[PDB]
Amino acid sequence: MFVYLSKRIAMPNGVKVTSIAWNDGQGWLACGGEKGLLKVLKVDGGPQGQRSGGLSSSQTLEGHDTTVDLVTWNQQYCKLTSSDVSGRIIVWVLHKGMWFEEMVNNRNSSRVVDFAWNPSGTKICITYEDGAVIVGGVDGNRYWGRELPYKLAKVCWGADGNSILFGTATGEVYVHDASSGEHLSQVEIKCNDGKAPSPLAGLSWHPAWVERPEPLATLAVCYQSGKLQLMTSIGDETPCNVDRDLPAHFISWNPSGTVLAVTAATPATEENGPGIVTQFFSTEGVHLRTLRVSGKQCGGITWEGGGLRVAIGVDSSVYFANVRPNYKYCYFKKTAVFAFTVPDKVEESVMFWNVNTNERRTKSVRGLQYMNACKDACVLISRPDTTQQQRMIQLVNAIGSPLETRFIDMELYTYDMNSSAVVCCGDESIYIWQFRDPSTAVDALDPISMQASRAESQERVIHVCDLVRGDTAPTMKVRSALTNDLISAMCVSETHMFVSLESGTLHVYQLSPLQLVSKYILFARAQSMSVNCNSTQLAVIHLGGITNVYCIEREKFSLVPCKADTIDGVELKDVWNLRWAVDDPHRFAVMEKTRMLVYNHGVAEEPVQSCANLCKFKSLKIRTLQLDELLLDPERPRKDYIVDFEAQLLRDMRAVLRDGTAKEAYEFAESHNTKKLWELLAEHTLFQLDFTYAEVAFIHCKDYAAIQFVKRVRSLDDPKKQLAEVNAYYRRFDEAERLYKDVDRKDLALDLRYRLGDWFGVVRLVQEGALLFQAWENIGDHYASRQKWSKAAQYYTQCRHYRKLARIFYIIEDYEMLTQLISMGEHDKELMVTLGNMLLTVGLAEEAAKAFIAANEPRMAVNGCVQVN
Amino acid sequence: VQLQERVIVFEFFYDDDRTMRYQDIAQIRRRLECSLLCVTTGAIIVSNDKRITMYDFQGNKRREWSMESPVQLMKVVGGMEGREILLVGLNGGQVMKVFVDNPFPTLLHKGTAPVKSAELSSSRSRLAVIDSTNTLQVLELGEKNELLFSEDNVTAVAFNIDVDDNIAFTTGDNTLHIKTGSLPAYQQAVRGIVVGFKANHVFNLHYSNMMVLDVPHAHALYKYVEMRDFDRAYEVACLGVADADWKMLGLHAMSQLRLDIARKAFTHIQDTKLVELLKSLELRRRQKDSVLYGSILAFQGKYNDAARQFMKTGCELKAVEMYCDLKMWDNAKKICTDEKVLKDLIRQQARWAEESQNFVEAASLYESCGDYAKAIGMMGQAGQVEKL
């Protein structure tokens, strides 16, 4: 998960922010500040509004004589509520697009310290410092009011909606009833020392997993000291309490409930100066990220309704930090793969979506933690039991059929994969599962999956510090030798392996064999690493945020630590995605801030405004996946979320071919000499019926099949058929069948539709004016393989193919038509024997015997009658 | 549902809103004692010790069978309405079919140990028997049950409801074997026992947890490709394998001179390069396995191995022309050895250099060839006066 600042809005007069609240349903952010400043801005949470910077509305409200202290939202009815130091509470309701008051009250008793809505947005718990609580309805009908004895400071809402959690001024937390409000119980706290009453700063219970079989640790209790305790229930006995050194003032769960955000106003004790530091954790207490900004006073922190932006009130301004959540996804073989959560389950659903055919295969994985892919396979790493430190590593193929599985009982933290191994690193130890012989050439005959199955697995577990050599004995024994330099990042190439340590050292191993061949010294610790196609350059995102592309030289491979040579012109800050061109070692794409840059040889292109996660970079094309939109309808992916960009070289070749001569395109291709450019040139000149440029292009890039295709097209006579064949080559089948019809040749059109294998289209072409029966039989086979027995029976009856039709009828348990089939199959003898055997097995021996005598051999008939008595 | 004093028969149905509902359609107010219970379409069946009694939904008895040994297992395996088959296992090792209309069981299997569990195939032409020793035997039913295979320490078994020759059995070491045909078994090492098996799923129960596990059809496809039987490879592939699996299947089918299944394997890939390779191969076939595997590898992208394959058959001319058509004559020169073909190849080099706007190289190639008639014009085009 990455964070980066992406906007800043200054308050008028420089009024310091004291409260902030962002709506989910529409997008109306609200801010407050002293001298009674209250503002409502509208921001578009869509990616289009993030790229275009959409801030449609900005309205300054009024009605508060002093500082706006608390701002809260209701997302079911989009109803705002604000408070005041003087002791007034005002509700605000939208009339025709603008904001107006609806109720103003002043208790004149104490100072309100909190109020919140239930998940349905039906009750608001206006609570004061004396302990007085008033639960009001949507309209204002006071459900119940009380004067609790202790001094309340923080108030939450139960996830289910029937309990209300209160917090004392001392620091204790109680659970009361929603309706009656009596003292139901007290939460078991253990982060609080109990020596002195520590005030609390965060108390939030996100209801996203109320109906979850094993509810996640969405409860959060935070104290002013900074002790965070994530519980899963009212009285949970084993909270995932994760401590942080920094203090805490405000907390906020994201709308998905999967990330907590805790902000702190750090004073001038540190050398960096005063600032605001926001720590972002997951539900397990894992510290995900931290964003530091300059400032002195913190006003609050809110999440965008999509959970993709955080609005932080820094002094007298508001910062919008875009949040890139860590999406577990991959792309391979024209197949995107992505995981998502369903509120009613514990497992995670991993969709394997083929985007070329829109084919969906969903797999249930329990406790998924990593995903990757290479060539013809994918890797899913999971932790089926949270308590048991057992890691399952499943190698699967494109549609999700499991290929191999391993179980490693050590605590991994980083993972990676290449075409012959799966490498997983913990604190110090490194597990390597080589599932394939790397010397064997991966091709279409022997993909990763087939070679992995046919071959044997070699598992090793080595240490970070020990100098593994070729003659070092492989072992499965992890070593907890106390080394201070823990592993921070890791990466794998097709021929090497790269480990980064916490200090900033970079070990470089080989893979086949496993030798620690080099060491390097980096500027700081690496938090993310990646390696180019031929393992010459290595991109590192450091802990600070600066990305550098070091050079890795086999000549300079020495075991002594030394400085690593970077690449000039590449110094990027706040990078959240990177990809390397799998065919060109120099090109690489970077998603940083809100834009994409396509570097070649170190010099970038013009930035492209995008937020789609990078999926693939190959043949000068860049395929990206808008996962922020795809996860809104995870079960319904749309091809419009796949965005294809091109390199400047590809765009220039497109421009040259569009408005230039063939010779200019030839000169461009010969000057730049890329396979994609030659293929594009050949395609464009084939569509224009000029074959010499296509031939030389298919010669320069190595493609013998395309050379033979071009020669075959040349050897023809009618240009219309040649253009139809060229359209057939490049997956333009409608136009090919049109151009085949236009020469009064339906036979070639139906041959094309049969070779492509859309037997529906073959049916359509045949019906227009044997092969119809063949197409019907193929459709019946397709429907049978998908266990659609009724439709398979339909198409088999239309085909009049009784051998498979009988098996269909046996499957449906429909023996009426099964006994019927004898009359129309009497001319078939083998069918009669099979039918008689089927009815013998099911027990109906009378129709079995008449079927057998239809086969002109009744000994089996009398046998079956005997055996059934 | 057998309660403490009644037996309640429910029926499941769907409403207008496509939400499944249950309705209690029968009550039998008879205190029944049995070791096994089986419901059917219209009648229930209870079984205790030796006696199997079949009752109607009101409570009146319909039939009764007395066996030879106490009954250990009883299971309905489906059939026509009112004539549904049963399957009974006895302490004597007898597995028999008890039709609810017949009063006479039919003998299927005679075992040497008490039968703890037994299931019938989807086609009901094969039988799986689990003895008292946790030893499983799968046999082909008939006049004499011919044994197909046997595996020890089996805790549970299931047959594929949708596929005939597909068994899934869980052994005592928490390993779930999945056999298809005569092939070895995919092993997953998952806890609990297998209780169901469809075409693409395995329903494995571990205590109170039901888990659905995907069936790898690629694993059987690999083994079927390895032993060069392709019909079963295609049949397993049709159950759903990845695009690379179809690609590999078609390529291996082509490399074995078996193009009929190759044309069917490349229907599911959507890659026209293999389709034009297929149509070129059939263009040849309408007019040698080591000859055509060279063509397969040439279209794959390994021209050196293709030329080696063309060397294996002893005909070098085809590889020579193949290397000529790639316009890299360095690799074409070593293979070609005929006296005329050196001159032919350098003539082709000269023509290609002429058509590639490389005039000085074309003049040099012509001087190597000795075709001065065109070499004069090519040298004039090149522009070196001294050489002219």
Integer Cα distance of A198 and A189 in angstroms: 12
Instruction: Kindly state the DSSP code that residue A78 receives in the 8-state scheme.
Output: T
Q: Which neighbouring-strand residues pair with A487?
A: A501
Burial A274-292, CB ≥16 within 10 A → b, else e: ebbbbbbbbbebeebbebe
Method: cryo-EM
Q: Let me know: does A743 contact A721? Beta carbons within 8 Å.
A: yes
A-B contacts at Cβ under 8 angstroms: 157
Closest residue by Cα to residue A159 from A306, A242, A283, A64: A283
A199 CA: distance to closest CA in chain B (Å) = 44
Residue type, position A652, single letter: D
CA angle B182, B185, B186 (to 5 degrees): 140
Integer Cα distance of B109 and B127 in angstroms: 9
Work out the burial of residue A491: count CB atoms within 10 Å of its CB; fewer than 13 is exposed, 13-18 middle, 19 or more buried: buried
Q: Do A843 and B85 touch (CB under 8 A)?
A: yes
Integer Cα distance of A389 and A20 in angstroms: 41
> Which residues from B are below 8 Å from A357, CB to CB?
270
Closest residue by Cα to residue A213 from A368, A366, A371: A366
Integer Cα distance of A750 and A129 in angstroms: 82
Q: Do B238 and A785 touch (CB under 8 A)?
A: yes
* Structure tokens, A770: 């044997």
396-455 of A, contacting B, C-beta below 8 A: 397-403, 405, 407, 443-447, 449-450, 453-454
Cis peptide before A274 (omega within 30 of 0): no
Q: Do B83 and A728 touch (CB under 8 A)?
A: no
Which residues lie below 8 Å from residue B248, measured CB to CB, with a gap of 6+?
A444, A445, A446, A447, A450, B225
**Is A817 part of the contact surface with chain B (CB cutoff 8 Å)?**
no
Work out the burial of residue A741: count CB atoms within 10 Å of its CB; fewer than 13 is exposed, 13-18 middle, 19 or more buried: middle
Q: Cα A841 vs. chain centroid, distance in angstroms? A: 51
Integer Cα distance of A687 and A698 in angstroms: 15
Q: Do B80 and A843 touch (CB under 8 A)?
A: yes
Which residues lie below 8 Å from residue A185, measured CB to CB, with a gap of 6+?
A174, A175, A234, A235
Instruction: Kindly state the DSSP code that residue A435 receives in the 8-state scheme.
Output: -
A695 CA: distance to closest CA in chain B (Å) = 10
A693 CA: distance to closest CA in chain B (Å) = 11
Q: Do B279 and A446 touch (CB under 8 A)?
A: no
* Structure tokens, A199: 């005030």
The residue whose two tokens read 């496509």 is B18
* Structure tokens, A569: 């012109």
- When computed from its CA atoms, the radius of gyration of chain B, rounded to whole angstroms, is 35
B185 phi and psi, to 5 degrees? -105, 130
A382 CA: distance to closest CA in chain B (Å) = 15
SS3 (DSSP) at A240? coil
* Structure tokens, B343: 């001159």
Work out the burial of residue B33: count CB atoms within 10 Å of its CB; fewer than 13 is exposed, 13-18 middle, 19 or more buried: exposed
**Is A196 part of the contact surface with chain B (CB cutoff 8 Å)?**
no
Query: What is the DSSP code string of A794-845?
Result: HHHHHHT-HHHHHHHHHHTT-HHHHHHHHHHHTT-SHHHHHHHHHHHHHT-H
Give the side-chain half-sphere CA count within 13 A for B148.
20
Q: Largest Cα–Cα distance in chain B?
A: 120
Q: Let me know: does A298 contact A276? Beta carbons within 8 Å.
A: yes
Q: Cα A624 vs. chain centroid, distance in angstroms? A: 12
Question: CB count, 10 Å around CB of A452?
Answer: 24
Integer Cα distance of A736 and B127 in angstroms: 53
A480 phi and psi, to 5 degrees? -100, 35
Q: Do B244 and A357 touch (CB under 8 A)?
A: no
> Which residues from A are below 8 Å from B250, CB to CB?
none
**Is A387 part of the contact surface with chain B (CB cutoff 8 Å)?**
no
Entry resolution (Å): 3.4
Q: Do B272 and A811 touch (CB under 8 A)?
A: no
* Structure tokens, A449: 């999956």
Integer Cα distance of A311 and A313 in angstroms: 7
**Is A356 part of the contact surface with chain B (CB cutoff 8 Å)?**
yes
**Is A866 part of the contact surface with chain B (CB cutoff 8 Å)?**
no
Closest residue by Cα to residue A704 from B302, B146, B145: B302
Q: Do A843 and B267 touch (CB under 8 A)?
A: no
Across the interface, of B80, B272, B298, the residue whose CB is closest to A844 is B80
> Which residues from B are below 8 Å from A787, CB to CB?
162, 198-199
Burial A409-442, CB ≥16 within 10 A → b, else e: ebebbbbbbbbbbbbbbbebbbbbbbbbeeeeeb
Q: Do A707 and B239 touch (CB under 8 A)?
A: no
> Which residues from A are below 8 Å from B252, CB to CB?
445
Question: CB count, 10 Å around CB of A823?
Answer: 8
Q: Do A708 and B280 touch (CB under 8 A)?
A: yes
Q: Do B216 and A869 touch (CB under 8 A)?
A: no
Across the interface, of A333, A709, A757, the residue whose CB is closest to B267 is A757
Integer Cα distance of A549 and A530 in angstroms: 9
**Is A787 part of the contact surface with chain B (CB cutoff 8 Å)?**
yes
